Amino acid sequence: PIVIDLNKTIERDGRKVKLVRATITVDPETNTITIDIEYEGGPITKEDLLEAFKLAASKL
Amino acid sequence: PIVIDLNKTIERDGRKVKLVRATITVDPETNTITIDIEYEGGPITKEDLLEAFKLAASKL
């Protein structure tokens, strides 16, 4: 269970999304990476989750 | 269902891992990003999956 601090905000389309943490779950047997993303902000969307998906990778 | 071409190889610790594709599944209702990673190469590990996890984010 890999944990990454983000501490970055995204104000996309008027939605405040202050990022908190990214909990990465890597499973080498199914070739799958699962990413839990905690944020303290307004309603999140699929476009915003890809942004925090970019940020989590840039921090490791 | 987002699909990203990778076409990059990783020879970490003597394991050839030629990357093929990354199938991203974003779920805004559980704050989870699921990543399927197809590769044509030797045995993959958790360290190698994080590398293709970095590459998939860098391509979008």
Numbering used by the authors:
A (entry chain A), B (entry chain A): 9 to 68
Copy text from the publication:
To evaluate design accuracy we attempted crystallization of 19 designs and succeeded in solving crystal structures for seven (three C2s, two C3s and two C4s). All crystal structures had the correct oligomerization state and closely matched the design models (median Cα RMSD of 0.6 Å across all designs, with resolutions ranging from 1.8 to 3.4 Å). The side chain conformations in the crystal structures also closely match those of the design models. HALC2_062 is a three-layer homo-dimer with a single helix from each protomer packed together between two outer β-sheets (one from each protomer), while HALC2_065 is also a mixed α/β homo-dimer, but has a single, continuous β-sheet shared between both chains, which wraps around two perpendicular paired helices. These two hallucinated structures are distinct from any structure in the PDB, with TM-scores to their best matches of 0.59 and 0.54 respectively.
Here we use deep network hallucination to generate a wide range of symmetric protein homo-oligomers given only a specification of the number of protomers and the protomer length. Starting from only a choice of chain length L and oligomer valency N (2 for a dimer, 3 for a trimer, etc.), the method carries out a Monte Carlo search in sequence space starting from a random sequence. The loss function guiding the search is computed by inputting N copies of the sequence into the AlphaFold2 (AF2) network, and combining structure prediction confidence metrics (pLDDT; per-residue structural accuracy, and pTM; an estimate of the TM-score) with a measure of cyclic symmetry (the standard deviation of the distances between the center of mass of adjacent protomers within the predicted structure). To eliminate such over-fitting, we generated new sequences for the HAL backbones using the recently developed ProteinMPNN sequence design neural network (accompanying manuscript: Dauparas et al.).
